[PDB]
Amino acid sequence: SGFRKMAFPSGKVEGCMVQVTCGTTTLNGLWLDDVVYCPRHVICTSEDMLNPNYEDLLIRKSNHNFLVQAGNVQLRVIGHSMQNCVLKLKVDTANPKTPKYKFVRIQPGQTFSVLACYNGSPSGVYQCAMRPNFTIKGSFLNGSCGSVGFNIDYDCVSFCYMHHMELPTGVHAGTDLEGNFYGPFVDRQTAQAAGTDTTITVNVLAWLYAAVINGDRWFLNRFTTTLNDFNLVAMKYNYEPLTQDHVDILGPLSAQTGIAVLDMCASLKELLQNGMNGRTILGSALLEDEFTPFDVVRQCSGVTFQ
Amino acid sequence: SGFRKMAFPSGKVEGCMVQVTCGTTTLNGLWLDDVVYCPRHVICTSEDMLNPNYEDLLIRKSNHNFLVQAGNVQLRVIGHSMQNCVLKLKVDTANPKTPKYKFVRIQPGQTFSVLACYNGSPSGVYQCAMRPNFTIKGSFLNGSCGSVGFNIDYDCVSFCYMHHMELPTGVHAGTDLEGNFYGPFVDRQTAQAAGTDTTITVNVLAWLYAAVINGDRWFLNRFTTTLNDFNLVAMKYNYEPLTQDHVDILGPLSAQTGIAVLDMCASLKELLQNGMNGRTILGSALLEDEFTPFDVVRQCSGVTFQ
Ligand SMILES: *[C@H](O)[C@H](C[C@@H]1CCNC1=O)NC(=O)[C@@H]1[C@@H]2[C@H](CN1C(=O)N(c1ccc(Cl)cc1)c1ccc(Cl)cc1)C2(C)C
Numbered sequence: 001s002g003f004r005k006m007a008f009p010s011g012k013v014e015g016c017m018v019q020v021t022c023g024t025t026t027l028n029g030l031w032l033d034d035v036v037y038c039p040r041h042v043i044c045t046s047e048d049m050l051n052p053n054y055e056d057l058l059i060r061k062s063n064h065n066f067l068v069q070a071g072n073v074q075l076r077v078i079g080h081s082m083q084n085c086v087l088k089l090k091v092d093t094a095n096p097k098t099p100k101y102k103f104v105r106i107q108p109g110q111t112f113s114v115l116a117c118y119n120g121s122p123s124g125v126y127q128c129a130m131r132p133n134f135t136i137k138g139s140f141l142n143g144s145c146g147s148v149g150f151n152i153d154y155d156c157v158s159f160c161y162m163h164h165m166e167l168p169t170g171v172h173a174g175t176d177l178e179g180n181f182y183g184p185f186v187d188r189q190t191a192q193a194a195g196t197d198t199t200i201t202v203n204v205l206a207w208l209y210a211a212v213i214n215g216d217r218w219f220l221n222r223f224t225t226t227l228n229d230f231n232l233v234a235m236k237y238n239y240e241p242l243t244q245d246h247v248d249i250l251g252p253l254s255a256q257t258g259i260a261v262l263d264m265c266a267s268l269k270e271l272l273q274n275g276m277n278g279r280t281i282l283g284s285a286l287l288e289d290e291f292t293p294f295d296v297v298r299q300c301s302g303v304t305f306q
Numbered sequence: 307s308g309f310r311k312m313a314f315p316s317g318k319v320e321g322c323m324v325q326v327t328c329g330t331t332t333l334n335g336l337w338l339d340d341v342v343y344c345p346r347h348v349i350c351t352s353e354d355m356l357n358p359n360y361e362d363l364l365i366r367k368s369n370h371n372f373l374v375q376a377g378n379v380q381l382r383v384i385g386h387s388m389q390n391c392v393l394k395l396k397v398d399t400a401n402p403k404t405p406k407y408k409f410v411r412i413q414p415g416q417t418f419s420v421l422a423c424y425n426g427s428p429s430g431v432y433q434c435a436m437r438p439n440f441t442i443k444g445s446f447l448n449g450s451c452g453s454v455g456f457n458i459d460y461d462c463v464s465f466c467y468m469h470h471m472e473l474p475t476g477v478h479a480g481t482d483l484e485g486n487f488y489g490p491f492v493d494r495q496t497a498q499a500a501g502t503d504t505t506i507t508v509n510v511l512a513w514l515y516a517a518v519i520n521g522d523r524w525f526l527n528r529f530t531t532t533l534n535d536f537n538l539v540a541m542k543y544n545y546e547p548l549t550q551d552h553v554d555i556l557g558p559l560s561a562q563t564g565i566a567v568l569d570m571c572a573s574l575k576e577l578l579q580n581g582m583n584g585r586t587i588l589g590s591a592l593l594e595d596e597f598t599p600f601d602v603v604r605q606c607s608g609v610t611f612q
């Protein structure tokens with residue numbers, strides 16, 4: 001037993017991480033087969049970053065301007081192209097450590113692991129959720145751009161995020177691996193703002209089930225509620241609406257604990273209207289929303305990755 | 307910016323993890339050079355685990371009873387010996403993925419990363435602290451024994467923990483890699499209890515500094531206090547005494563923020579006596595104590611590992 005915010009083992013992604021330097025900008029790239037992917041704002045100077053025309057900036061670049069550094073081995077760049085907000089640097093060596101992989105785009109409310117990197121060297125791994133407002137609450141310092149987010153399915157790495165920038169509230173924005181931003185953000189050094197967030201209701205319910213599985217039961221009650229009457233309460237506390245598909249997805253956790261989904265909704269309703277009154281749930285004094293139903297089932301059942 | 311509970315990249319440890327099966331018990335082993343380390347209770351049956359005499363049990367074993375499984379390659383065991391509560395299985399192949407490593411024993415209050423494993427396959431990575439009562443609050447299911455805890459220093463893996471058991475409160479107990487238990491626990495299926503815990507005061511102060519660095523300032527005050535008068539408050543709220551060495555260790559964080567350590571103590575005193583009054587610190591509604599001063603400096607500065 002126990003419940004921890006758990007990242008995927010990072011070894012398969014560590015073997016893909018390289019350093020990309022152009023001019024005075026150094027960031028991280030992702031090396032898969034003979035392509036290195038990295039944020040296109042590597043081609044910018046300090047005054048380029050204010051309102052850049054990236055097509056103009058890129059035509060003025062040469063293959064030899066891009067220094068790609070894989071550990072202590074230099075990778076010769078033999079082609080370059082831009083795809084949306086990422087650069088694809090074609091190199092003369094295929095990465096012998098390339099795992100089986102996919103480029104997937106995730107939905108708000110879904111989670112992934114982030115391998116934070118600096119100078120092509122991995123620094124730490126941690127779990128993130130895509131917020132409803134398409135930001136992530138990460139841990140990123142200067143030089144972290146090009147660090148990626150991912151999930152692992154059995155032996156396959158599904159890359160879903162590449163890091164590009166920090167917003168004024170200290171949250172983070174980036175792209176999928178096709179270079180398309182999550183949310184209404186642009187890779188320009190201009191004033192942008194996250195936009196209002198909401199709490200991921202289905203994830204909070206999943207975490208309440210994790211708690212019950214682990215022996216925290218004090219928030220349970222005999223009461224029940226209808227889905228419509230729960231969603232009236234959710235709206236008022238800035239929670240996302242709960243759909244019948246969310247109820248369906250929570251089915252297995254409901255069956256394992258013997259607590260009906262709508263009964264757990266009644267419990268959540270009381271927690272929202274009363275607070276916790278000095279008690280904790282799974283070591284937290286807040287309702288936690290960055291665990292999906294899948295994350296709960298995985299951890300409270302023990303799936304591995306080969 | 308941002309602050310996350312961050313684990314070390316796990317790739318170097320992933321390459322050491324193997325499956326050890328003996329009789330009807332399967333658990334994980336750690337393969338370094340030509341030795342596989344694993345909990346000695348792998349040699350036990352169901353009724354052996356109640357009050358085992360491990361010396362007697364081990365003399366009745368043969369090398370061929372131990373099935374060691376490294377991915378899809380079987381490792382032939384050519385010797386076995388017991389060291390305290392771990393078994394050392396000498397195998398006929400040195401692990402070509404053996405990183406540079408050390409066996410270190412950590413202190414309560416220190417943190418490490420855990421690579422949770424099942425059937426020799428890594429499942430997830432997360433950060434733990436050694437509690438003052440020598441337990442850890444982990445996430446461990448059946449078959450997780452032999453999963454290890456570690457820190458990484460530059461290129462060197464310092465292994466500090468091997469997992470052995472869960473206690474009745476749902477916390478976890480294990481050994482260092484010399485097989486010596488952390489705390490007063492034994493690898494017997496008998497009733498044992500954690501013993502009273504305390505909060506790691508120096509770590510809470512480090513986390514308050516992390517918060518300030520990241521722009522949470524509402525808990526700051528003009529007040530100050532003496533070290534002796536702070537420790538009178540710490541005792542009452544079941545916090546560990548703060549020593550002058552703790553004050554010294556917090557020096558760099560104090561200098562970076564411009565907030566004197568004893569001033570931050572006055573802030574902590576007020577938080578203990580008043581609570582938080584509906585506000586949060588770094589996304590938590592509780593005072594968090596599983597970040598060391600080192601963890602804060604590392605993350606709020608950006609050290610990597612090659
Ligand atoms: C790439 O390594 C870096 C990652 C940043 C650095 C700190 N945390 C991060 O996530 N990305 C950037 O520096 C991008 C890049 C230029 C500006 N930028 C950025 O993150 N910041 C920024 C955005 C808009 C404005 Cl008006 C000013 C700065 C930024 C915000 C906050 C902080 Cl503390 C640092 C940098 C591009 C081209 C947008």
Ligand SMILES: *[C@H](O)[C@H](C[C@@H]1CCNC1=O)NC(=O)[C@@H]1[C@@H]2[C@H](CN1C(=O)N(c1ccc(Cl)cc1)c1ccc(Cl)cc1)C2(C)C
Nearest residue numbers: 001347446447448449450451470471472493494495496497
């Ligand atoms: C090894 O894979 C396993 C890891 C356990 C399993 C669930 N969580 C864990 O950390 N370790 C054990 O099963 C050890 C092993 C026998 C008993 N044991 C153990 O963890 N449990 C236990 C300890 C004492 C008593 Cl009286 C009864 C059980 C245990 C506690 C709680 C739960 Cl939910 C499962 C198992 C050894 C030889 C102590």
